[model samples]
Target: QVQLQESGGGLVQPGGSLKLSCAASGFTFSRYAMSWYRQAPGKERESVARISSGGGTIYYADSVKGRFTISREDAKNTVYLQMNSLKPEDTAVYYCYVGGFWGQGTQVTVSSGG
Candidate 1:
């Protein structure tokens, strides 16, 4: 079965940036489309964007159009989501999915101004 594992998450201060990684296994990553979803406290899941197979195209949600980047590392069979201009409202669990395979989400926390 295909598997997607997420990593690179922790406390990030407001205005800071964070990059989350989604490593894929048991499948040819470049042959499938990948998407990112985020769930904030008490809020429904939101679709971040989708990267076409083999990293051809990307469709980003309007809400994060200018603040998020979705890219791939073909050699690593991994995809990454880098979010900038951090805010408390950005704290949430992010999930990566390809086909029906989904990764156990990683949590991103935004700390109060330090």
Candidate 2:
């Protein structure tokens, strides 16, 4: 069984940053493809990032547009997301995925102020 877990979520002041992590287990991490997505507050889905490769392939959606960074760390068998310069729009239920037939997900919310 292949499973991925996203750890790291919370509020960030505008212009602050956050880091997200996806830990993969029960399968070969580097041999598969992974994609990270954001489910915005209104339930609209956005493709924030992707990592497809044993050779390494990366992509981003116009929404995030390189406003962040995504990386695959084989040594830890995990994918990491580091994003900076956040706004209210970045608030959502975010999850990391590997292939399909995956589980439900994890979540977080963002706001301009407390």
Candidate 3:
């Protein structure tokens, strides 16, 4: 079975930045797109973007800002999605996802970074 895991610091201080990594195993990473989502506390989830594994071309939905991007380290079999200019409202869970397959969601808390 294919599985995805998220690794990152569990906590962030106020005004600091947070970075996270998503690692894929048991599947061909180059065959699928890597997508990211954000879920704010007490609010519905939102799609950040989706990027092609082969060329890293990205497509962002209307809800996502230019500050969000997707990147990959092919040698490590991992992909990363980053968000900048974060605020308190950005504190929530971020998910590494693909359609039809189960997703492993990771929580990220953005304090006050700008």
Candidate 4:
């Protein structure tokens, strides 16, 4: 069996930027594609984007079409998503998925800057 674990989530203020990362293990990471998404309260999970196996291409869902960026570090078998210009409405639990399975998610909370 293989596994994908997600990390690097923390608080961000409105207009701030943050990133979450996922690393693969127990298998060849570059052999499969990866995806990122988030769950909003009582709503269907959002489809963020999908990354190609070789980390060459990415296709993002319309909701995050402009303000988000997806990238990978091939040698490290890692994938990441960066969100800039954060909004209060963007707080939620973001997930990393490999193949048809999901890894434990990272929570992103947006707060007003002190």
Q: Which candidate wins on TM-score?
A: 1
lDDT of 4 by residue, 27-68 (tens): 778788889988867778888888898778889987677888
24-66: candidate 2 lDDT, tens digit per residue = 8898788877788888866777788888766367898877876
**Pairs clashing in candidate 4?**
none
Off by over 4 Å in 1: none
Each candidate's clash count: 0, 0, 0, 0
Model 2 misplaced regions, further than 4 Å? 101-104
User: Against the true structure, whose lDDT is highest?
Assistant: 1
Scored against the true structure, residue 68 in model 2 reaches a CA lDDT of 83
Model 1 scores what on Cα lDDT? 0.90
| CA-lDDT, candidates in order | 0.90, 0.78, 0.72, 0.85
TM-score of each: 0.92, 0.88, 0.80, 0.90
Off by over 4 Å in 3: 13-15, 61-64, 112-114
